[PDB]
């Protein structure tokens, strides 16, 4: 439940940090907290294209596999190789050290369609209250 | 958990039995163990292609929902319809009657990136160890 003020969010609980012509993607604090302990991460290869709403990789917790969808379209230029040996950084640092991939955005106005922090907070409240 | 000897395994805990030009896919004993009693299984249609690393279905247990990812690429030629009426066959028979789909392999050499039984047994040990 920590939500950061300067990121863009997808309903499936991924964040995007757009700085200039690159965008960094990871999963949110709400996502890691609900998956439980993350024990493995599967990432794409550099030079690969990802597409808005299609899966690019997977996070595995002690109980389950969760496929992660790209929040925007682009070409992977950098992959967090530190996560393979330290998958736990997703639980400890989802917004900083737990980043997963860096992309060159090919259709940057897809960022218009993403939820901002307040909208993502209300969304998580609604989703958790369907309980 | 049992690990069978002639099978290949993906890190997301699916197995592959390749026989002739058919490959049968399911979830491992370790996977069903950690998931708990399976109560619902979502499976593709015959005719659909699956891609290595991409989800083709999902298992829903009493405790977690888990995406099921294809270990290799191919076209779905048969799905286990028995699984809709008896989802618990994944818990009782993960390697035989609980099979989920059969595919025709598109690139048989993807099998060479999968884990053999010994490596998989060890991988499961890291995962389950306190970190």
Swiss-Prot record, chains A, B:
Residues 22-104 form the Lipoyl-binding domain. It is found in: Mitochondrion. Keywords: Lipoyl, Mitochondrion, Transit peptide. This is Glycine cleavage system H protein, mitochondrial. The modification N6-lipoyllysine is found at residue 63. Binds 1 lipoyl cofactor covalently. The chain holds residues 35 to 165 of 165 of the full protein. One of its GO terms (biological process) is glycine decarboxylation via glycine cleavage system. The glycine cleavage system is composed of four proteins: P, T, L and H. The glycine cleavage system catalyzes the degradation of glycine. The H protein shuttles the methylamine group of glycine from the P protein to the T protein. The keyword Transit peptide applies. Its cofactor is (R)-lipoate.
């Amino acid at each position: 439940s920590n939500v950061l003020d300067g990121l863009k969010y997808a309903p499936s609980h991924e964040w995007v940090k757009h700085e200039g012509s690159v965008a960094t993607i990871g999963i949110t604090d709400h996502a890691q907290d609900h998956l439980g302990e993350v024990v493995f991460v599967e990432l794409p290869e550099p030079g690969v294209s990802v597409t808005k709403g299609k899966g690019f990789g997977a996070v595995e917790s002690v109980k389950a596999t969760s496929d992660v969808n790209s929040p925007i379209s682009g070409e992977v230029i950098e992959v967090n190789t530190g996560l393979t040996g330290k998958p736990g950084l997703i639980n400890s640092s989802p917004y900083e050290d737990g980043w997963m991939i860096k992309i060159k955005p090919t259709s940057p106005d897809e960022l218009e369609s993403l939820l901002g922090a307040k909208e993502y907070t209300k969304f998580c409240e609604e989703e958790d209250a369907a309980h």
